[PDB]
Amino acid sequence: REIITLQLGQCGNQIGFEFWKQLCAEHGISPEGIVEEFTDRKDVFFYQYIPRAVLLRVIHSILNSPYAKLYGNNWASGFSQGEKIHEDIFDIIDREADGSDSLEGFVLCHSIAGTGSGLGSYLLERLNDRYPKKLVQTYSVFPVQPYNSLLTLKRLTQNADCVVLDNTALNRIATDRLHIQSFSQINQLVSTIMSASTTTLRYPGYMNNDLIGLIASLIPTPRLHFLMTGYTPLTTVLDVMRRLLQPKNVMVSNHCYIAILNIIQGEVDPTQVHKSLQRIRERKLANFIPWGPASIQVALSRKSPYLRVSGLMMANHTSISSLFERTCRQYDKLRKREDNFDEMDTSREIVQQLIDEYHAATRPDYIS
């Protein structure tokens, strides 16, 4: 199986370029795409080595960097221009998909705030229509700005089969424990999460060896497909498992979890893992849905020898609905302040359905 990544807009290319820089170093691959001398599965992302990337002004900064050997602001303008080059950009993907052994997914790195907002919404509709069996995971990044923010939200709630990273929680963590006061400094933090998000697809493990294994575990219902991240070390597994549940680390600005996935990338002791989960159940640090039986999953991994204990948390929290109301509320305030303008309210209508879908998920009778 393979995964082809797509990078749209200025935000996509940079956080994508920093994603490949971190991964090329994790493996024994020199910046000129030559293996250095100095067991890790590298066929999923690299093609025998060349990354399976599709980049879409900022391109010149990449071509002048030492990594050259490795390859408007209205949402309507972004959607329109994609319609004009439909066959052009779909000719580099078709060969990228066909030439692949057995395609599995389409990782998308973009921010919903201008062209990547529109051109991103356009490709998301074409992708599902062209292939219905291909997963589309999108590493969206949250910030006329309120309009374009919810328009893509309409497309992300029916097209994308699965991770939010909001800049507000990025700015707060930056000033708190990193002392930045800068785009080039926050990108070092997001790329650390991305390279850690797929740490179970670059190393042959016991379970979660496929992209559909990470997705179907968390997402119970195709509407509730928004996840958040947690990454503590910026020692036993109990210390890491407790620090991840602190809201000071969750990258999100009643309420309960639906399913949690913990990633431990260290050399920790494999028998004490059940002991930590036991004390979590006693102290009751996390609450879950009352309707369906939900559990917490923890998986170990092995760090690359060429490139200490870390930990990442992937969870499906109902509190993510709060972020949508902020985008939703700001829209109505702009709708009273200023061909048919009917595409917006349809988007406004469908996003409200998800919000009510979330608030009804935390009830003991969410079914029907």
């Binding site: 199986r1 067991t39 890790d40 599965r41 590298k42 066929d43 052994d101 057995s102 599902n128 219905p132 069996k133 997963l135 029916q158 097209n159 089969d161 190393y203 042959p204 493990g205 016991y206 379970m207 979660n208 060896n209 496929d210 559909i212 294994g213 997705i215 179907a216 575990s217 997402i219 119970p220 219902t221 195709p222 509407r223 399913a259 002791d269 494999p270 028998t271 893992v273 059940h274 989960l277 036991q278 159940r281 609450n287 879950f288 849905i289 009352p290 309707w291 369906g292 039986p293 939900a294 559990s295 917490i296 999953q297 923890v298 998986a299 170990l300 079914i367 029907s368």
Partner: protein, 302 residues
């Protein structure tokens, strides 16, 4: 199955073959498929010697009942395995093969629903019964995706650590045999393949069966909605008569409560076999770590 990357590709290639009955199955065909998997996955970067012994064997139904790897070993190294470790690994490999196809089935169903609602989201009369198709899935994938963790941490990663610890310090090749022999008496015990835990495994098989019956009672409700959708598409695109179809559309709404009584009686029986499963675990000690995995947040036990 400690590789994971290789067994993933190997379950995607044997799918078109094992669905056929065993009578049409011949060993000489599968070897080309196994050899293809070892070449595509990360298992290619590996010692050529150990890759010479890894082959297939045919147990003696369906293709998912007679396939298993062997890894025959002869020579001096055969004094550590002694024809009994090879008669125990295969006794284990079945339980890890079943608990691996019962998961890739449940991530295929979850893949279907991730494409289902993206087509028929325009029929509000069907989402009422379609909803019970989702909840029963997410209640079922938990029991499997959780037991799949008890296999990794409580059986493989823990019982193997007590082996690599009593080998780097052992010697005289008689502390190695006795450390590798007990390594096959805990995995048999921590898994439910013992002799006195027979009432437990046969209880688990019923839960393993209810996952298959869902896949059969799902595509029937899935396809029956795509046919009626396809006819409803052609019944209006060629014309843009009206009374002879409202009885067909009207009766189609009347068959919905029939299917609802299926998923309402399939679920009420699935929960009756899991809430009975937990009662059997309170029997012989490491199983207590499993009752916590399944009964997290106490959704069962009232």
């Amino acid at each position: 199955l400690g590789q994971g990357d290789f067994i993933r590709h190997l379950m995607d290639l044997l799918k078109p073959e094992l669905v056929r009955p065993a009578t049409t199955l011949y060993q000489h065909n599968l070897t080309g498929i196994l050899e293809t998997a070892v070449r595509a996955t990360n298992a290619q970067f590996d010692s050529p010697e150990i890759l010479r012994r890894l082959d297939v064997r045919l147990l003696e139904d369906t293709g998912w009942d007679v396939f298993s790897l062997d890894y025959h070993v002869d020579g001096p190294i055969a004094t550590v395995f002694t024809r009994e470790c090879m008669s125990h690994y295969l006794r284990v490999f079945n339980f890890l093969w079943r608990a691996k196809r019962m998961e890739y089935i449940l991530t295929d169903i979850r893949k279907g629903h991730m494409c289902n609602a993206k087509l028929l989201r325009n029929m509000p009369e069907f989402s009422g019964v379609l909803h019970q198709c989702h909840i029963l899935a997410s209640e079922m994938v938990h029991f499997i995706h959780q037991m799949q963790y008890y296999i990794t941490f409580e059986v493989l990663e823990c019982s193997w650590d007590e082996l690599w610890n009593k080998v780097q310090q052992a010697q005289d090749l008689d502390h190695i045999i006795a450390a590798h022999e007990v390594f096959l008496d805990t995995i048999i015990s921590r898994c439910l393949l013992d002799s006195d835990s027979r009432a437990l495994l046969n209880q688990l098989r019923a839960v393993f069966d209810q996952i298959i019956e869902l896949q059969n009672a799902q595509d029937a409700i899935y396809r029956a909605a795509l046919e009626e959708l396809q006819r409803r598409l052609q019944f209006e695109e060629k014309k843009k008569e009206e009374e002879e179809e409202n009885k067909r559309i009207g009766e189609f709404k009347e068959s919905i409560p029939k299917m609802c009584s299926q998923l309402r009686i399939l679920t009420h029986f699935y929960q009756g076999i899991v809430q009975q499963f937990l009662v059997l675990l309170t029997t012989d000690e490491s199983l207590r770590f499993l009752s916590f995995r399944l009964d997290f947040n106490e959704h069962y036990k009232a």
